Amino acid sequence: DLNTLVSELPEIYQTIFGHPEWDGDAARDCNQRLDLITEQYDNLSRALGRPLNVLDLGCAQGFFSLSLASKGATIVGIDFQQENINVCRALAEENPDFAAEFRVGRIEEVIAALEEGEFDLAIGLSVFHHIVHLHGIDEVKRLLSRLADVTQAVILELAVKEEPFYWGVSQPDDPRELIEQCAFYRLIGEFDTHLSPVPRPMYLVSNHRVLINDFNQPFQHWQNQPYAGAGLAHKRSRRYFFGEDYVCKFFYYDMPHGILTAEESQRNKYELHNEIKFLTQPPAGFDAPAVLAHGENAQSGWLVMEKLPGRLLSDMLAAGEEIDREKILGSLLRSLAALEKQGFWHDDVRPWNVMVDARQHARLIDFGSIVTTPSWPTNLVQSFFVFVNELFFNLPQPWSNWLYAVWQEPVERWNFVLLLALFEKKAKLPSAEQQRGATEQWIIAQETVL
Ligand SMILES: C[S@@+](CC[C@H](N)C(=O)[O-])C[C@H]1O[C@@H](n2cnc3c(N)ncnc32)[C@H](O)[C@@H]1O
Ligand SMILES: Nc1ncnc2c1ncn2[C@@H]1O[C@H](COP(=O)(O)OP(=O)(O)O)[C@@H](O)[C@H]1O
Ligand SMILES: [Cl-]
């Protein structure tokens, strides 16, 4: 009998599924977490086009497991307490149509034994802190990595050090330390535990999918830096995910260890905001990539775009790949000239901001640096020369002749329309080497070093 099994529970942690007579006795009501978990289940189930296989780690009295089984899920629940599992099985029997299995077992062992594809979704609510306490942070990070590796998605409610209990002292400084090694993560809620005033964050984590309420898709690889050789400029607060026809930029506004300034957060916020603005409203006759999704919240913001073919110029340069400098410069200058005519300029023309397709046509890929108003744009023309030089001191005829021509122009005349015009006629232009010159060359060379 259920009554006896319930009585022999060391603790009625959760609501007893289907038995409201014990609702008052339950430490946690579970309705709030359930509402959120069911929402995420639905999202993922919709995306994959079917009911899910779900793994419930430290399943206690089976509330979440049974609740999901109720909606059609196939579930396996694990708990290391025999009493808990006995209740779960009993409840399952009262609901014979539910596809629900329960096993007495250790989370550590089950995770080690998992195979990829076995489960779509794993839930681990207020359990991993126990594992941290006995086995340390590094082992837990590995467990969670593997869990992520073998599933599509993972939901965790994580206990925190601020909680007033003795075990809090073993906890990481920040719960994100347990998951940040995983590819994708988002805060999805915060819950009152009724143990104390300190709430527990609930995180949605994945090593295989971008999981955004509006956009739920696999990705094939991701990176923590914008390009090969970026170093640590953004202090790792930015992540990039690449899928079949999309790129997802995910910016953290909030980082652990307080590492993001105020200024840096705001710049993350500003760049993303700025990028969305431009892409949603681009100028006529400018092939700009398309916006598939976007959003912001307190912790972070994101943008999903159409993917554009090709390789990043800076990589190609570094990896000594063969390039057509004429086609690259021509295509790029053409786009800059056209932007300018529409009263747009790009503040940051660099190799890491240029993408080159298989036909050696080049385009800009970072629209964070796009601007509308300012003498000007004389500075931008100047940097473009550096760009040119780095793309190759280094300029053969007629590129040198081109630059020399521009340098002979009064500064009021300098803009991208001019730069392009002269570029197009560069073979006709006088020879730089035949003139005193010689300074245009030395200035940029120093600039380009600088
Ligand atoms: C505090 S409760 C949380 C219960 C449930 N996940 C929830 O939040 O509603 C922790 C549960 O995990 C179980 N547990 C703790 N450590 C475990 C481990 N290493 N392996 C399996 N179960 C564990 C306990 O028996 C208990 O049922
Ligand atoms: N539309 C896109 N298609 C393909 N790759 C992209 C696209 N947008 C960005 N990237 C990639 O993102 C990386 C950094 O993107 P970027 O636009 O520089 O973001 P940020 O500079 O704000 O970090 C680039 O190295 C590039 O590989
Ligand atoms: Cl936890």
Side-chain angles (χ1 to χ4, degrees):
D1 253 23
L2 191 53
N3 281 14
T4 299
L5 297 168
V6 164
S7 156
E8 61 209 343
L9 290 175
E11 183 183 5
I12 301 170
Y13 189 84
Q14 306 172 327
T15 301
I16 310 299
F17 188 86
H19 288 274
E21 63 268 31
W22 292 296
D23 287 358
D25 300 332
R28 310 190 62 188
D29 289 325
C30 298
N31 58 305
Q32 295 196 261
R33 286 179 307 152
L34 184 62
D35 292 339
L36 197 54
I37 279 165
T38 64
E39 154 183 329
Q40 289 309 321
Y41 178 90
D42 288 343
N43 287 352
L44 185 58
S45 180
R46 192 174 317 116
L48 298 185
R50 63 166 167 82
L52 311 183
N53 296 314
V54 184
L55 179 65
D56 190 0
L57 295 169
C59 67
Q61 295 75 53
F63 186 72
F64 294 98
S65 276
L66 295 165
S67 291
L68 292 177
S70 190
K71 293 159 48 69
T74 304
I75 78 81
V76 173
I78 301 298
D79 204 274
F80 76 176
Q81 293 184 78
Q82 186 69 55
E83 294 92 328
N84 285 343
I85 295 297
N86 292 340
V87 163
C88 295
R89 294 181 167 149
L91 292 165
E93 280 155 18
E94 297 181 347
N95 304 267
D97 295 335
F98 289 5
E101 304 272 356
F102 297 96
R103 310 288 142 200
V104 182
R106 291 199 68 94
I107 286 163
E108 299 97 328
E109 294 163 11
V110 173
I111 287 165
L114 284 172
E115 307 180 357
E116 177 156 21
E118 177 178 358
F119 297 99
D120 312 307
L121 180 65
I123 70 171
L125 320 173
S126 289
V127 62
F128 279 98
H129 67 277
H130 293 102
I131 300 175
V132 173
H133 194 55
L134 311 180
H135 304 278
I137 296 165
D138 277 337
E139 157 174 346
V140 169
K141 286 171 72 64
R142 285 180 187 102
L143 292 169
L144 290 176
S145 289
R146 182 148 211 273
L147 189 52
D149 284 334
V150 300
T151 60
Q152 288 298 298
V154 187
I155 297 171
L156 303 167
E157 185 188 40
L158 298 166
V160 298
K161 85 166 175 315
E162 289 71 26
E163 291 189 70
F165 315 103
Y166 68 99
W167 51 259
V169 167
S170 302
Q171 292 296 111
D173 211 342
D174 192 295
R176 278 171 289 180
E177 287 171 48
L178 300 179
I179 53 171
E180 76 196 353
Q181 77 287 1
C182 292
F184 185 88
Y185 81 87
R186 262 170 70 209
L187 188 62
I188 59 164
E190 232 136 21
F191 297 89
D192 191 335
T193 66
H194 303 106
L195 302 164
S196 88
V198 186
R200 295 185 182 157
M202 183 173 291
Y203 290 97
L204 182 61
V205 180
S206 187
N207 272 351
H208 297 289
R209 300 183 73 89
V210 171
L211 300 168
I212 286 167
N213 276 357
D214 198 23
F215 190 86
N216 187 317
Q217 298 287 346
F219 62 81
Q220 295 72 48
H221 58 90
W222 72 285
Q223 50 200 240
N224 212 350
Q225 50 182 20
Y227 54 90
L232 295 292
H234 305 298
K235 300 198 165 171
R236 295 228 181 289
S237 72
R238 315 187 163 191
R239 292 179 179 215
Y240 306 82
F241 307 87
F242 304 81
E244 225 278 322
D245 52 27
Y246 80 85
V247 180
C248 180
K249 284 190 207 196
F250 204 93
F251 289 8
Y252 294 99
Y253 303 163
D254 175 344
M255 288 264 101
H257 303 289
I259 46 161
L260 221 76
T261 72
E263 206 181 358
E264 290 162 317
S265 314
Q266 216 153 320
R267 267 182 273 129
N268 274 353
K269 204 152 163 214
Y270 177 77
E271 291 183 5
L272 199 87
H273 190 86
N274 211 50
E275 186 153 335
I276 293 165
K277 187 172 193 232
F278 177 81
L279 293 176
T280 48
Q281 290 294 326
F286 183 83
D287 201 349
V291 179
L292 302 179
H294 69 91
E296 299 187 60
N297 70 25
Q299 293 77 227
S300 67
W302 57 89
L303 174 61
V304 185
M305 298 174 288
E306 257 182 25
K307 195 166 124 120
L308 299 172
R311 292 147 169 75
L312 205 71
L313 175 57
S314 45
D315 290 339
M316 295 176 73
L317 278 166
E321 198 173 295
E322 278 208 40
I323 55 162
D324 192 332
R325 289 180 281 282
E326 177 62 25
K327 280 182 185 194
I328 288 171
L329 284 165
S331 58
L332 205 62
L333 274 171
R334 282 189 297 278
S335 75
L336 293 173
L339 281 173
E340 169 177 283
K341 283 157 164 280
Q342 307 300 313
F344 290 93
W345 302 261
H346 188 297
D347 200 19
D348 198 22
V349 180
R350 316 292 272 298
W352 49 89
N353 289 331
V354 176
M355 278 202 61
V356 185
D357 72 24
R359 304 215 273 106
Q360 290 291 325
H361 290 156
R363 71 192 299 186
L364 295 163
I365 56 138
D366 195 80
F367 318 95
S369 280
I370 286 269
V371 302
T372 286
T373 43
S375 109
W376 209 76
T378 65
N379 293 314
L380 283 58
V381 172
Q382 179 79 343
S383 60
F384 194 78
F385 294 134
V386 173
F387 180 71
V388 165
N389 237 302
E390 58 189 343
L391 190 61
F392 292 76
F393 235 62
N394 300 339
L395 293 187
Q397 287 199 54
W399 286 280
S400 53
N401 296 345
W402 168 47
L403 144 70
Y404 180 86
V406 176
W407 267 75
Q408 300 316 297
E409 294 284 359
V411 153
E412 73 189 328
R413 284 174 56 99
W414 290 25
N415 60 39
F416 285 93
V417 168
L418 181 111
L419 214 47
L420 169 66
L422 283 172
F423 170 90
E424 281 168 2
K425 304 278 180 137
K426 62 184 175 308
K428 304 207 298 150
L429 293 174
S431 173
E433 60 160 33
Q434 285 187 339
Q435 325 294 331
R436 3 209 192 271
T439 100
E440 79 292 301
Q441 269 300 337
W442 297 125
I443 292 153
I444 283 149
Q446 288 174 242
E447 289 251 33
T448 293
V449 159
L450 213 161

